[PDB]
């Protein structure tokens, strides 16, 4: 029922005026066809959707923001969800995020408390968890879904966690 | 009754002599029409207002101030509310705010106390909560509402929290 | 009775030889007219005053001093109250104030004690509270009141708190 | 009886070879005239003195010394009291004072102990309290009183506290 | 049954547009032939696989990331598994990793806690453990298996732990 | 009996080869004339001395030494007492003194212990107390007394405490 | 039986493209000849081996890695064992090692705990213990054994412990 | 009996090849003449000595050594005692001394323990106490006594304590 | 029996390609001649050896390694023992040693624990004790013994302890 | 019996190729002549020695080593004792010593523990105590004794303690 589609199974088109674009097509199988699930293999996969039924989208997005040159330590992530005339926007939000700068270093105290592994320290300290739930609605009649992630203040390096994805709930 | 209109559903017009402008039109539906609410999708939406009745506005504004070049660590935010001759000002106030500078960094002690996540540290330390309540009154006869946020001392980067908005109380 | 007139309802005329000037006119309504109060909306408003009666002024002035270029950490604020020939001075005083410099930064210890919010630290540490009470007397016959705030040693940035104002007591 | 005359009611004439000069005239009202007091409004006021009677002067002088360019952290204040041929000196003294330098900054420990407000820290740490009592005698026959405050080692910024003044005792 | 094939028994082809490539051929012995194991000697060895049976691959990958010139302290490792027209991708994933920079040094406290040996400190602090399990499926009909490890943000030095390898489960 | 003559009632003649010179004349009133005392007003006053009787001088000298340019932190003060041919020396001594340098600053710990006021810290830490007692003898027949204070190693700023003076004992 | 051959009894040929080479010839004495042992004198000695019997090699390698110029604090040691056409490789492995940099210094705490002698601190902290056991097999028919130790990332100084050697087990 | 002759009552002749010279003549009064004492006034005084009797000299020498330019923190003081052909040396010794350098400053801890007064800290920390006792013998037949104090390594500033002198014991 | 020959009784020939050379001749006295001992006076002495008997050498070598310019904090000492065609090597070994660098300084804690004397701290912390025992054998037929001490990585200053020497056991 | 001859009673001849030379002649008084002692006055004195009897010399040598320019913190002192053809060496030894450098400064902790006086800190921390006992033998037939102290690594400043000397035991 709750088909989770990871973002690595989307088509990625990086740009400079719109940030990162996650677009993917939609396949509409008819009723009584045993809805399949999206294989979590990081391969471009068409999203299975019931033929005529409204689907509600839950966006789970974990990412690491890292500064390129400007080294500003706070930024605003812009999320824009589109759908298949031209594409019409159905959702837009902004989320303040923390971005790694070259002047940031772990204190020895942070190693002792947050975990000896330094990946754990970034997971508990710098990971940006963004969850848009019960806000996006999409129907299978539309044949395209697009997600835009753009940094507002400065152009930066975004490291999207592999488990980030959109949950297509019943 | 208490229709909350988030600021991301307003039309944004950034400038250099007036700061950021949040203008939006007003729709006047007649009585007995089941007042709708503003969908929190970040899309430009006309504000629903009762046909002939005085509305009181409560401005909730959470934002992150961040210095561009001047790096001054304190600023004065200027809030100016207009309405639809030319637009007439109905409210004006100033609020001192704290702005992130490139010379500011978290101490290890702040990580331990305010929260391991560094977004929590900014939320509890640098977030500017500004609440103008029971001070602004607007009637549905006027067909425009405008909010101006301008920094006085220096031109800066303002990161408005997504939950910031104006509450149109009964 | 105790009509509080905030300074943002005054007319502001910034200069370079006299500092900031807060001038505003006076309206003299006759007796038995239900003395109104000044609306705290930050809009230029004539001060209501009883037709023939001596009023005593209490100046409440909270402000943030911040250094522009000189970066001197102490200054002398000069307060001069005038009234409506030319304007005649009726009160003058000086108050030492603390001014933010670019070499000043919060210690981690100050965050823990004075409050996690950094605006609280400035409120409890750098805010200059100046209260002139029972020293200024003005009658409604005069049709102008002017307040001058000037820094003596150096030209600086003054951030006047929005609640600063003059209380016109019975 | 103990008429306190604040120094801001004197005439101030700043110079470069003599420092700051506080000169003011004297009015001699006759006996049985209900000796008035000096209004603490910071306005130039003639000092009321009994017609024929010796008055003893108590000089209360609180000030903030602040270095201009030399940044020396200790200085010698020279106090010279004159009276109304030319003016004849009747008192002279020197008082070592502490002067703020641009290399001085508060430790976090001083904030916790001496008071969260940084004006309190300067009041308890850098304020120079100078009290000359029972040393100066002046009669109302002389029609002028002059006080000179000059820094000896270097030319500096003196911030005289508003409550500083001369007490004309019975 | 669970034949573990270390990555040092693969053929290594370092590049600049695709990172490090681990390609190796597959030998298909028939049934009833006493499946041999891969000798852990770091020598190029053909992978033994049952003639007609689906094998599931478990990728165990421990590595040390170290910055060359860019000195960025966080990176995204890209894993792409291919198989033997041209090679078709069957799996792709990204894993955030921590990379040693020349500005990083051990604190004395880390020596006391994580172990006196400094290799233990890197093992418990900087070693990137990446385990893809129950996600990759490969059949012996295909005669080639390829693994690509590429750093996304910057070109870096990857030190693959000798025990890293792919487990060919029953 | 013990007439204390403060040094500010002497005539001061600063030089460069002899340091600071404190010279003053002597008045010899006859017996049975009610020996007066020296008024502590900082005005040049002739020293009252009994007509024919040996007087013993006690030199009390408190001063603040402060470095001009050389910034050496220790110096040798040279005291030479003369009397009224040419003047004949009757006493000479040297006293090591501590001199303020521009590289000296108070620690926060010194504020807590020696006193919150920073003038108290200099009084208890840098004030040079020099007391020559029962060593100098002068008779009223001689009509001049001269005291020379000169720094030996370097030319410096001496801040003589106002209470410093010579006690003319019975 | 377990003849231990220290590496200092090998022939050393340092290079730049292959690192350090430890090559030595093999003498094949016949059966019933009282197998001698290798004298631990650091002199080039032929390895005694039984005439026709498979020998298993256990490599014990303790070394100190020290950075020359690059100062990177982690490296990958490459071990390649050859034997006597051209030489054929029979074993290859990689071992991450810790390398001394010029920015590394002992904390006083490490002296107290790991031992007062500073050679003990390096022995317990920086010594790289590498033991390849039960992985290398060599027969006496081959007349040459070669061991290559090469640093992968950077060219460094390797200080091989004198007790390092290869154990030729029964 | 134990006539103490302070060094300031000697004739001082500073040089560059021999350091500081303390020479003074000797007066030989006959027996039964009530041996006088040397007045401690810092004036050149002939040393009283019994006509025909061997005197033993005890040299008490307290001094402050301070570096001029070389800033070396240790020196060797050379003491040479002569007497009245040419002068013949009767005693010579060397004493290591500590010399103030411009890189030396008091720690806050030294203020708390050794005394709040900074002259006490130098008295207990940098004062060089040199006492040659029961080593020098001089007879009144010789009419001259000379003491040479010279620094060996470098030319420095010596601040001889006023109580330093030679004790002429019975 | 156990004749200890200190290394200072050897002939020292410092070089640049071989390090320090300790060569000395051998005298062969016949049996029944009361074997003398080597006088520990630091003078070149022929080593007494029994005419025809194998002697076993025990090398005791304590030294201080100190960096000249390279300042590397770890080195490898190379010991080569020769004997009297050309000289034939009979022993060779390498010993890792710790070398003083100009960036190394004692902590105050090391003074308290390892001993107040700073020579004790070097004795317990930086002294390299090297003891080769029961490994070197030399017969009196050979008329020369040579010991070479050379630093491998860098040319350094070796301070050989005076008690270092070779023990010629029975 | 145990005549102690301080080194300051020797003739000193400083050089550059041999260091400091302490040479002095020997006087041979016959038996039954009441052996005198060497007066500790720092004057060149012939050493008294019994006419025909072997004397054993005990060298007591305390000195302060201080770096001139090289600033190396460890050195090797070379002691060579000669006697009166040319002079023949009878003893030679080397002693590692600690030398003051311009980068060395006392910690506040060392003042508290080793003694408030800073000369005590050097006495307990930097003083080099060298005692050669029961190693040197000299007979009165030889008419000259010479002691050479030379620093090996670098030319330095040696401050020999005044109590250093040679004890001529019975």
Residue numbers in the entry:
A (entry chain H), B (entry chain G), C (entry chain F), D (entry chain E), E (entry chain I), F (entry chain D), ...: 49 to 132, 145 to 230
Quoted from the paper:
Lipid droplets (LDs) are universal lipid storage organelles with a core of neutral lipids, such as triacylglycerols, surrounded by a phospholipid monolayer.
Similarly, cells expressing Sei1∆LH, where a flexible linker replaced the LH, also failed to stabilize Ldb16. Atomistic simulations reveal that in WT Sei1, TM1 and TM2 adopt a stable conformation and maintain a constant angle indicating that they move largely as a single unit. This coupling of Sei1 TM movement is impaired upon disruption of the methionine-aromatic interactions, in Sei1∆LH and Sei1LL. Besides their uncoordinated movement, TM segments in Sei1∆LH and Sei1LL appear to explore a higher membrane area. To further demonstrate that the effect of methionine-aromatic interactions was restricted to the positioning and dynamics of the TM segments we solved the structure of Sei1∆LH. However, in Sei1∆LH the TM domains could not be resolved, likely due their increased movement.
